[PDB]
């Protein structure tokens, strides 16, 4: 009876049963294949590896992400992620109970339809349902009104909601995300003499980005501080020894959000898109959105990002408007907890996309119901 | 008043006065030291030899390149190359007039700064200026728009430019270069029974690579042709007699560019990096870059490389886009002629890094001005 959930993130897969506070299994969204010949006999060494198994053997594997900017490029590869998600990671049959999926807004219709075409034919779930990755965050926060900021590894949206009413006119999409931070972080390290120029070497640079980078509340003041003081310099032990030390690169890449002029994207910035999206709404709605600015998903773990975003929107926003940015510790999963909650609703049982309705209407049934 | 130029290539030094069509002196970027004891008395036989003098005595000298992948390893050695460049090769004082230098993009900041620290203290030029090796090629070609491919002995970059505006987001760097071709050429000859396993023996294999190798427009078709027909087999007279004959090895190594799977580098290839770099740019810019694909620097002398690259990008690129790859005969020096031109500009007189400004700001003055 319980329906499982699969986030299908643009950089990380997060799946678990509904009504559960923590997910059962999480693994990176990667598929690798050998770039070297197999000398051994009776070694196994098959073609495809996914999840944390790929990181174990990444040295001799070239990693390609099947999901990119919330858009699926390799469909045969993404099919392997789901087979590994259910059978290998969770060890649960999909045919017994339905599944809940998530996807970023304004994606192409083919991704939204083809996603459904694979489930019922390959795995044959009893039913299915897709949901915008943003809306689930409210369920986790337990508030009807607010503006959500996903910041996943592929895309960020900045959609406002007012008492549960989504406004498609105010919704936004910006492709800047963690892979751009990693690709930019791989670039600026060239300055310090460290070179990471492969798929396997990318993952270490991503690992450096997680535990060591901060948002730099005051960029211009901190850059002058970095050159004068070496206190910010810290080291990370990449494999193969070769300790390293990053200084102003520690906080150069996360600034790409607030100003993407470094990477070259013609975008206003994360702070101004939330300012733009709120101004697209009616005048009466703006008060509650400033008071309820939900922060969710990955890329929001940089310490002080709530302080930078509160300091920044406050300058653009008018006085007398109280700005409170909700950055709970449980983010990086809040989209998932919304799925456990959204599947738990008894009302939600009507909204599933059953097998019998698919054969009648075809894969175009998603748009009218979802 | 005239300012000299020094390319400081990763495998070849090319220096001459500005406003000159041909360079005054060219010599390999090598420093050698004896690996045998000196039996003679009053023989000279000092420690260091550089340039073509080293090739003369290479039999009893172990050659180490001071510049490697556009990165300087032995600083005391590279100082000797410049002393030989000005005093011995050109016979010109550096203190009288300033000097123009070149360096590959995305190099570490230490190489970019330490390069400056040596000039003003050791040689004491009146001023200096550094420039990315790619931009100079446009000056030689006399066109504002285009995408450049240096292919020097150390590194290749593939940077696009649009009306003189460099885009750092689209720039690329790949360490595959001629030394990898030579090291790979030294490997595959083992197959034919020829063994070159020393620094001195490396130079003959490099000499074989220059005058005898071609790009093989159709690799798979030509390999089957090589086994069936012996017409492609030619001979080279290495010293010590011992004539040799290479067949499919004649064109096996330059294919490492288009597919580095042979040497094992996890890279897309030279054809696809130019395809990747152009796609990173805006949509309107792509038309002119396809029409203006400049080919410069060493490693581009393989006959038909313009045909292979035009044939290859045409398959990846969409129809209706005219692809014209500019491979002038004067390449292998086009970076230098840009230096003679770039120094000749009257506007350029403001952009020098003078001695008086160095003492005020220190060696960190390079980044803001250059």
């Amino acid at each position: 009876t319980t329906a499982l959930v699969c986030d299908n993130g643009s950089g990380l897969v997060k799946a678990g049963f509904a009504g559960d506070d923590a997910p059962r299994a999480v693994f990176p969204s990667i598929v690798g294949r050998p770039r070297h010949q197999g000398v051994m006999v009776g070694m196994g060494q098959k073609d495809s590896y996914v999840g944390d198994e790929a990181q174990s053997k990444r040295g001799i594997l070239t990693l390609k992400y099947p999901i990119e900017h919330g858009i699926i490029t390799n469909w045969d590869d993404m099919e392997k992620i789901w087979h590994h998600t259910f059978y290998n990671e969770l060890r649960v049959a999909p045919e017994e109970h339905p599944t809940l999926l998530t996807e970023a807004p304004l994606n192409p219709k083919a991704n939204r339809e083809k996603m459904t075409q694979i489930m019922f034919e390959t795995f044959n779930v009893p039913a299915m349902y897709v949901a915008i990755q943003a809306v689930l965050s409210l369920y986790a926060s337990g508030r009807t009104t607010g503006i959500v900021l996903d910041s996943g590894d592929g895309v960020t949206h900045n959609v406002p909601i007012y008492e549960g009413y989504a406004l498609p006119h105010a919704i936004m999409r910006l492709d800047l995300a963690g892979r751009d931070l990693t690709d930019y972080l791989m670039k600026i390290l060239t300055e310090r003499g460290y070179s990471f120029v492969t798929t396997a070497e990318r993952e270490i640079v991503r690992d450096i980005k997680e535990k060591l980078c901060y948002v730099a509340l005051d960029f211009e003041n901190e850059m002058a501080t970095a050159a004068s003081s070496s206190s910010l310099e810290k080291s990370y032990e990449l494999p193969d020894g070769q300790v390293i030390t990053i200084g102003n690169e520690r906080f150069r890449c996360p600034e790409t959000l607030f100003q993407p002029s470094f990477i070259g994207m013609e975008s206003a910035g994360i702070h101004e898109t939330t300012y733009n999206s709120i101004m697209k709404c009616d005048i009466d709605i703006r008060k509650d959105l400033y008071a309820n600015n939900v922060m969710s998903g990955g890329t929001t773990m940089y310490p002080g990002i709530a302080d930078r975003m509160q300091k920044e929107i406050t300058a653009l926003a008018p006085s007398t408007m109280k700005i409170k940015i909700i950055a709970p510790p449980e983010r990086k999963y809040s989209v998932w907890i919304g799925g456990s909650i959204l599947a738990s609703l008894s009302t939600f049982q009507q909204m599933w996309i059953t097998k019998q309705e698919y054969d009648e209407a075809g894969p175009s049934i998603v748009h009218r119901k979802c | 008043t005239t300012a000299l130029v020094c390319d400081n290539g990763s495998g070849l030094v090319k220096a001459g006065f500005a406003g000159d069509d041909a360079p005054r002196a060219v010599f390999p970027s090598i420093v050698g030291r004896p690996r045998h004891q000196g039996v003679m008395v009053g023989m000279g036989q000092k420690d260091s030899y550089v340039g073509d003098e080293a090739q003369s005595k290479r039999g009893i000298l172990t050659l180490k390149y001071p510049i490697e992948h556009g990165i300087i390893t032995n600083w005391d050695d590279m100082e000797k190359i410049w002393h030989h460049t000005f005093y011995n090769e050109l016979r010109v004082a550096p203190e009288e007039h300033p000097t123009l230098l070149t360096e590959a993009p995305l190099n570490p900041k230490a190489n970019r700064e330490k390069m400056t620290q040596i000039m003003f203290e050791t040689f004491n030029v009146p001023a200096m200026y550094v420039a990315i090796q790619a931009v100079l090629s446009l000056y030689a070609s006399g066109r504002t728009t285009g995408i450049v491919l240096d292919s020097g002995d150390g590194v290749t970059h593939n940077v696009p430019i649009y009306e003189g505006y460099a885009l750092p987001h689209a720039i690329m760097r790949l360490d595959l270069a001629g030394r990898d071709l030579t090291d790979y050429l030294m490997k595959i000859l083992t197959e034919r029974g020829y063994s070159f396993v020393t620094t001195a023996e490396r130079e003959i294999v490099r000499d074989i690579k220059e005058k005898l190798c071609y790009v093989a427009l159709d690799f798979e078709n030509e390999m089957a042709t090589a086994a069936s027909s012996s017409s492609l087999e030619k001979s080279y007279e290495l010293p010590d007699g011992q004539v040799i004959t290479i067949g499919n090895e004649r064109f096996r190594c330059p294919e490492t560019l288009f597919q580095p799977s042979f040497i094992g580098m996890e890279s897309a290839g030279i054809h696809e990096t130019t395809y990747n770099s152009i796609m990173k740019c805006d949509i309107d810019i792509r038309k002119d870059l396809y029409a203006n694909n400049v080919m410069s620097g060493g490693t581009t002398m393989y006959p038909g490389i313009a045909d292979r690259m035009q044939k290859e990008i045409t398959a990846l690129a969409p129809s209706t886009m005219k692809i014209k790859i500019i491979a002038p005969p004067e390449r292998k020096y086009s970076v230098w002629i840009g230096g003679s031109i770039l120094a000749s500009l009257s506007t350029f007189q403001q952009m020098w890094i003078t001695k008086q400004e160095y003492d005020e700001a220190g060696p960190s003055i390079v980044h803001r001005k250059c």
Binding site: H69, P108, A110 | -
Partner: peptide, 7 residues
């Protein structure tokens, strides 16, 4: 890139 056309 990863779109049916621009990007």
């Amino acid at each position: 890139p990863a779109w049916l056309a621009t990007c």
